[PDB]
Amino acid sequence: RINTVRGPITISEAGFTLTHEHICGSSAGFLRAWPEFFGSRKALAEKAVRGLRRARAAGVRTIVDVSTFDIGRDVSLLAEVSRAADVHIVAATGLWFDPPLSMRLRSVEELTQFFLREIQYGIEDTGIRAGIIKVATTGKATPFQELVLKAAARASLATGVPVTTHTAASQRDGEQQAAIFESEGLSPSRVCIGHSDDTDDLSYLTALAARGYLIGLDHIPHSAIALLGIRSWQTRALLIKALIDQGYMKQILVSNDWLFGFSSYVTNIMDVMDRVNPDGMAFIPLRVIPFLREKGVPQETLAGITVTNPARFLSPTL
Amino acid sequence: RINTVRGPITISEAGFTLTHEHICGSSAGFLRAWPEFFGSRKALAEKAVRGLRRARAAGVRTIVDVSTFDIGRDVSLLAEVSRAADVHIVAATGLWFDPPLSMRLRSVEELTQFFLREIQYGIEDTGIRAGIIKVATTGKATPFQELVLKAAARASLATGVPVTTHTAASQRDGEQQAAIFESEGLSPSRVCIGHSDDTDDLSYLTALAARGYLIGLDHIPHSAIALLGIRSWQTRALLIKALIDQGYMKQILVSNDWLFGFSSYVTNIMDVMDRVNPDGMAFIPLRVIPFLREKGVPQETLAGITVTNPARFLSPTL
């Protein structure tokens, strides 16, 4: 049983699942303070439903939202949009990078309790419970990172809920994360190590996958912001293929954003519509799957990645 | 007329005013998500009232809270505490350093409108209006800083509400701020340039004061965090005296925190009670004024700084 914003559902109910999305919250709470600019909570919910419905028509049935409290997560809006669009939504607990001092000053022990709260008791006063633990980490490696990583490993160990991370600026930063999880006794299959691009060494990726970790090609870091020039999503899609070819199809998780090349979250607060993904959340099913199929990847394999992988991952396993 | 959290009041009503305080909000909104750790909104309001009442007994009548939306400002809690303690509270508009991308990506024009909203229309859906514009700026000088400074100069020019800033890591960073205000046509008497310590060159301070700016010895930067060793508040108090001696008593604004040497805001989320100011907000009236009096400073002068200076500053002047 997986916790959704409308309650627990069974694994078989999940179906085709999109991971690492940000359905709402791009204002980071500023829409309450400046609805005139940001828009009203209702108009936002409308925008969302419209998008969900298109995705759903495309075949999507569940979505994993990874917004945390510190970046504007609003579970009640999520519950509302979920009901109206008839698409399951899993919400997250965790922290983003550079969290407020209030949390930044907390110990491993306190942090573990806050995450447990959001999962076992519910978020805020909503009675809505989290179904995943999100850990965003930026650039240079800090002690704080370690702590957060450890509190997340413990919350997972206690509950069986999965952990999804963002790897820092360090090299093979993921090996360093693996080490933390492992030293906490957390099974690697409970963890998704996320990456922002296709620049990592395949040898590095495969090795991690060989250890049991899930490999996420899952996010675009939130930034204001060339060397590498600019790759196409087609080229990034190819990485999936390689991993698959290497024998790792069971360990992959991929998001619309990582493929497209831009953070959807940021796009919404930007002036530029040039940055927009005309397919929205339907990008994977509408374009990416077809492309991979055209490259020779079998249907069933693609299905393993968009249905099986997510399900197994979300399913609380102790 | 000055806008308070309970409405407009006249200048003569203000009386003895404490500036640059953070009455609540140290959790940055996390108390909604984790009341078990942070405490309930009621217990917090209780803690606050108790403090206000002590200050009031000491002679304080008004307090300027400089929390902005991005760091947990809660005007409704402020309105409640104000009524219960019978102490006027002025709330702020503005932004802290490192604001979210949502605001970080806004133009001078948009930013001016948001500040105008908070002053002319009200904060959130409270109908409560801001009476000061706060601009916190950290270390290295950015273009973003410039922008925020300019939007604040325009909001002030339109409304007559004052601007209070935090000077960055740059040298004589305040000269650079002055330049911005001046190029916006804002009268210097509408601006308070804040400083975190007593390390600045007196020649630098006096020059700014000579131009008409208010000098704030007003804050302690929010940080996780020696060279300079550790000065006493008595030594910092002496700076006030020098400025006074130089002829600048009409241009000074000073806060409890700057004197004490620690950010009260941070202290509340820390583990260490060792960092606490046993006098709370009554520190200035209970200890600092007596000390200055003992150093020879005249009563009336001290009164000019804690009553007159604040009033004139808050009073919307175009």
UniProtKB/Swiss-Prot annotation, chains A, B:
UniProt key word Cell membrane: yes
Modified how: Predicted to be exported by the Tat system. The position of the signal peptide cleavage has been experimentally proven.
Cofactor note: Binds 2 Zn(2+) ions per subunit.
UniProt xrefs under PROSITE patterns: PHOSPHOTRIESTERASE_1, PHOSPHOTRIESTERASE_2, TAT
Cofactor(s) this protein requires: Zn(2+)
EC number(s) on file: 3.1.8.1
Single biological process term from Gene Ontology: catabolic process
Residues the entry annotates as binding Zn(2+) 1: H20, H22, K134, D257
Reactions catalysed according to its record: An aryl dialkyl phosphate + H2O = dialkyl phosphate + an aryl alcohol
Residue list for modification N6-carboxylysine: K134
Applications reported: Has attracted interest because of its potential use in the detoxification of chemical waste and warfare agents and its ability to degrade agricultural pesticides such as parathion.
Membrane topology of the entry: Peripheral membrane protein
One Gene Ontology term of the molecular function aspect: aryldialkylphosphatase activity
Localization annotation: Cell membrane
A Pfam family this chain is assigned to: PTE
Domain of life: Bacteria
Statement: the UniProt record of this protein carries the keyword tRNA processing: no
Family matches, as NCBIfam families: organophos_OPH (NF041153)
Assembly notes: Homodimer.
Function: Has an unusual substrate specificity for synthetic organophosphate triesters and phosphorofluoridates. All of the phosphate triesters found to be substrates are synthetic compounds. The identity of any naturally occurring substrate for the enzyme is unknown. Has no detectable activity with phosphate monoesters or diesters and no activity as an esterase or protease. It catalyzes the hydrolysis of the insecticide paraoxon at a rate approaching the diffusion limit and thus appears to be optimally evolved for utilizing this synthetic substrate.
Family: Belongs to the metallo-dependent hydrolases superfamily. Phosphotriesterase family.
Name of the protein: Parathion hydrolase
Organism per entry: Brevundimonas diminuta (Pseudomonas diminuta)
